[PDB]
Amino acid sequence: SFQTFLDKHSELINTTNVSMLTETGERYKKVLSLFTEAIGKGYKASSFLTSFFTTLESRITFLLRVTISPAAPTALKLISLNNIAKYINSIEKEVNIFTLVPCLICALRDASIKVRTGVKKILSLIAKRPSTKHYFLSDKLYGENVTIPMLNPKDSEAWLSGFLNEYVTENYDISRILTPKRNEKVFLMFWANQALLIPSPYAKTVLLDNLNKSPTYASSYSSLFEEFISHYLENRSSWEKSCIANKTNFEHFERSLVNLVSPKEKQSFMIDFVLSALNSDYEQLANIAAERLISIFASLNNAQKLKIVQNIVDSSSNVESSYDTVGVLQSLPLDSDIFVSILNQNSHLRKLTIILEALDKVRNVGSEKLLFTLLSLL
Amino acid sequence: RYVSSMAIDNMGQQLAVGFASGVISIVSLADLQIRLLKWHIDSVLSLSFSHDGSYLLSGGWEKVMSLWQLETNSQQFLPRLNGIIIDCQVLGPQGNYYSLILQMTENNSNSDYQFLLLNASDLTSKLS
Amino acid sequence: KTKKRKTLKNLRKDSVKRGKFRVQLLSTTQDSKTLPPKKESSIIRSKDRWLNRKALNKG
Amino acid sequence: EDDVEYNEELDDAG
Amino acid sequence: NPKAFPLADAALTQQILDVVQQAANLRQLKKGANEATKTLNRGISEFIIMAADCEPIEILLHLPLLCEDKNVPYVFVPSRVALGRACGVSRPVIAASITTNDASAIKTQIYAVKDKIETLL
Amino acid sequence: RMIVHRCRFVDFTPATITSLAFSHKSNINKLTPSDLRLAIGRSNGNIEIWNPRNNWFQEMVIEGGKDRSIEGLCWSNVNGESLRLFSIGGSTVVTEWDLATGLPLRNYDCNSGVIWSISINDSQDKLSVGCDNGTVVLIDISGGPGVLEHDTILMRQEARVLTLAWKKDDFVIGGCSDGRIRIWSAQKNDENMGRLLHTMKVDKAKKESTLVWSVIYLPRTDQIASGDSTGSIKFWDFQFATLNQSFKAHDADVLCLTTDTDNNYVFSAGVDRKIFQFSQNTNKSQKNNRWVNSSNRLLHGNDIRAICAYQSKGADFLVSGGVEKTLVINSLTSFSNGNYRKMPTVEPYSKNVLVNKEQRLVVSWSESTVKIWTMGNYKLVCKLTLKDDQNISTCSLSPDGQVLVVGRPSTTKVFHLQPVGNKLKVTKLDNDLLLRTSTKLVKFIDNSKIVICSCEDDVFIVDLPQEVELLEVTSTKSSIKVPYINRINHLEVDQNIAVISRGCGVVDILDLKARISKPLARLNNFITAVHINTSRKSVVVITADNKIYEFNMNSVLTQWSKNNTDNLPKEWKTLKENCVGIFSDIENSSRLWFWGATWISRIDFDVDFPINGLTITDESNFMNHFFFTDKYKPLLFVDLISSNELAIIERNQKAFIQPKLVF
RNA sequence: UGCGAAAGCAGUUGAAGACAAGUCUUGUCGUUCGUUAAAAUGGCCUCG
């Protein structure tokens, strides 16, 4: 019964009125199951939400994570998206809903047609929602002490007009509308500041997919996330547990990290991650970096290419890696002037042989300078 | 849509409803499933179920009696009756006799009813 | 026109007997792979002929 | 139709 | 009884036993393993019939060897009683042979049964 | 006022339907899978794949060729594997088709007589193949896609095997041309391997041969339902191999059969054009195991070759077709009482006819033969005959009309046309790259340059190859299950701007000089028509649900798009036939013409509109100023000849005599 | 419908009530008052 259903979870009542987006995943995971059974058993969704969440602002925001989490049924997701539309009307409005339209974009990135179609309608309401310049839980939404730096909401909503006036939810390409022609660069910046401060990996993946452009794979905000990637591998196991908690494929998230890597990689901090990821202990991280490094290696400085050649031959000779680094070595295209310096670099006997195997693996390459150092070796 | 005849099975599982168009529909009371039997070209005037319910007796303006075998959807014929069939009944512990009512609609001035008791075995008139 | 008809038979004739030897002409490998093989007319024509036999009085 | 017909095999032959 | 192979099915046994009963009337049937063996030695057998259920089955496993060497058709039936039954004798017959006669009045179905036994083998 | 040239001198005749097959096993409890599709076999060798969602839209077509046919179709749906389709062409080959490309993935010879029947076991790891020589061949497929291996040959007999059915994987049931039903054991680890356990003989017509055309196994009642040339429907006890019931229902041969998930209904059809429904739904019937001839219906004008059934929580489909060349769709639960649709014989999802505004030339291609007409009243200027057996996929004519490009999956050939004596002289320009090039879609940039999308979806420019970059598509479970949804469906080139639509709905803008790809749209419903308008600088996309979307080329979707996408007139929404063709109005660029198989519509994009059953309910996802006329139908192709001239092209067998009593 | 011969000679049809469809306009009647006043593919035994 409802009363018994409360008593079973009476201890599981949110003292905080904040989103479950910020709460423990496992505690939220059970609570979501309670939300579905409550409405399924005829227990009023709002009554359930009041029962185990403090305030209406929690009832709206727990439903948000129901949308963020793919495990929730899509029909449940629209009911989640419908009731938030109810609660955005109830709230006092002197603070801004520019905060949640990225969540609506994430809601656009949720699967079903009907959930997306509603989200435009909800999105269109937020455009009509006036701009206050100081947001809902501006220092409390995504983190307790995490203050979100956001656009001028006039630019956001007049832009968000584009979503209502100039987009249909049936389509998965928000990216063109996501980037306005008039201020594509000014807006490209804040998403970085958002995505730095968007915690959920699912929100990052869906957000990054829209942002990344073929000319620039997050070129401008690669510097912004350089710290995240540089220690992403350090806490990647902690990111991997989040994705399974978020019920997402982490390998796609790993591809989002290399999607963060810019196309041309004279850039020093992205190359540090791709190399570190490629030789990372994690089996899945390094393959995505390995494929990324191949895309990188085409777009490198010839000297930057040259340095990578020395590491992989030297690693394969001595460093036994889970992946065929000498096999990777064969795939990478190795310049003749590159082939010779690497022979000079080692002209350590075991490391030498693989270089002399490395030049062998690349048949039919011609340069006079090569044969000079060759003869120096033998 | 206009029903002209109706017959309830003894068990009550089957209900045959006729129509002015000449179509007969047997309905299973358990699940309201319909089964269409369509031979009569005019309104069916008389329907009656057999004691076991395996056979349906139908008669109408055709002046011909149809014994529908429901097991195989077959039907046996007794044609050239004197008048159109107003009523049909199986009269016997073993369905030995069929009792029939004829109208002879040719005489418009008066309704001339003729009662025909038939033998099921050879379909030869036992008492007119 | 009769010469044209005979030319079609020569094109039709992909195999013919030279003295004590029989040749066949070779079709392209692309034709065989790109599309499944040709149906035989006699076996399939037999069924349709049965389906349109006179006894049916098909009309 | 023979007036406006074009046959590739005949065209190929000559 | 894995040794007996090929074994005629229920329908195929029908026509074989029918021909055997016919061949009995027209004196074109040789009954018994050794008597069947003699026909194969003389090459006068259209084909050889054996019973699958016979115990020990090895008593008849020589006939396949003769039949294969002489390229003579052969086939097995499930029951030996039924074989001797069709032969027209009061005892079980585990094997029998049909004598070759191109002038016989029952020739056609013998070839037809033979043609099927060719298919079975 | 505008000029109409109504044209029926162009004749395109569909091939007779021969086989039908659903891609999934019916499950009433579960919801309809997104990957459900219907395969249609044609007598010309064409295989058509359709989607029962959003009414019925045809996702892909496999082109047949000369003197080839389809007589049996079979799906295999293994979990974790792509949907697998098999076909028999009436010869000694089982063809495995690459659904991604539509080409034969593998051709396997049965090492036996010509194939008459094909069937798959419930585990979907074995195919049963019926041969005319009475041999039934068992083929392994569990090895993998593209892997066909000989497993076992069942006991041989002398009667042609006309049909085959399975019981789980243990036994094979086959109807034969001798009027006998035959059962064989496929049980592995059993001494009765390949042996004929029982033989059942139907009642035989005295004066003519008796043929068992169709047989089906009924798991719930462990019975066999058989159709025979005598018009008899017979129910047989499986374990005892005995006749339970016999019904003389049809007046001619019963060619095919089908049943529902619960085996509560058996549906028979064939030569007499009638569909007879056999019912065992009543509880008393179930206890007694007795069927009832519930009803029959006359819906086809000619023989019903094929019937198939699908059911789910949101689907209830009985699809039938045959010599009439049209699909008839019914509800199994309400076959007697439910409404029906007769599918149009031709829906031009792919256009077989083009109209050239300059020179007033109308070109139609059918079965490797191309005809060109000129109209001032119409004259056949020239007729082209092509040697290669494979049917023409697409034909494109240059903006001058001199250069005609003929495309086939095997080869692409270009022919120049010169007007001499009110006739066109044909000269084949030789291009080695095009000859070796597969052409799924071809379009003209100008009188010289063309854009060709290969069957592998490699887009390149040929001047008469400059490859064009294409964005990568993320793999999805639906894409793995159905490969071709990720393949390019529509290719349009409009003033250097090229737009490609994939079956999954991916729309991208391609710049041909730049040869770079920029994502525009990714629709969640199948895209049925695309149009690019340079004047409004927008791209019009229409989905399977007949919603219209107009995308500015870089805020994307024109302001008209919001106010009118969900506010379309009643006519557009009410249509059960999807839009397939869009062409602009010369007089005014904003006005756009839209037409389907049976309707033509015009919409002004500068004006906003006043706000004021036989298909899947679509609970599940697809993956994972105004003028309307219906007078002209059916429409092969519609387009403008001049600013004031409209071209409408329209379509212009011995069957059973079922007399209609009249008094 | 009445008279008359079969030929014909005279004349007749309205008011509601209820329901279904559209969205206020239309249809239907196992319902009333008054006036003399086509169409569910559906054919008819055995007993030689």
Order of helices and strands of chain B: EEEEEEEEEEEE
Total domains of chain E, how many?
1
Helix proportion of residues of chain E, in percent?
Answer: 40-55%
Shape of chain B: globular
CATH 2nd-level architecture of chain E: 2-Layer Sandwich
Main β-sheet, spatial strand arrangement of chain B: 1-2-3-4
Q: What percent of residues of chain B adopt helix (DSSP H or I)?
A: under 10%
- Give the CA-CA distance, first to last residue of chain E: 17 Å
Beta fraction of chain B: over 45%
Count the DSSP helices of chain B: 0
Tally of contiguous helical segments of chain E: 5
Oligomerization: part of a larger assembly
The CATH topology of chain E turns out to be 60s Ribosomal Protein L30, Chain: A
Distance between the termini of chain B: 35 Å
Largest sheet of chain E: 4 strands, mixed
Query: Which range does the strand content of chain E fall in?
Result: 15-25%
- Look at the helices and sheets of chain B and give the structural class: mainly beta
Mass-distribution shape of chain E: globular
Derived from helix and strand composition plus strand pairing, the structural class of chain E reads alpha+beta
Radius of gyration of chain E: 13 Å
Largest interface, Cβ cutoff 8 Å: C-F, 22 and 36 residues
PDB class: ribosome
Keywords: SSU processome, ribosome assembly, RNA folding, RNA-protein interactions, ribosome
Entry title: SSU processome maturation and disassembly, State E
Chain A: U3 small nucleolar RNA-associated protein 10
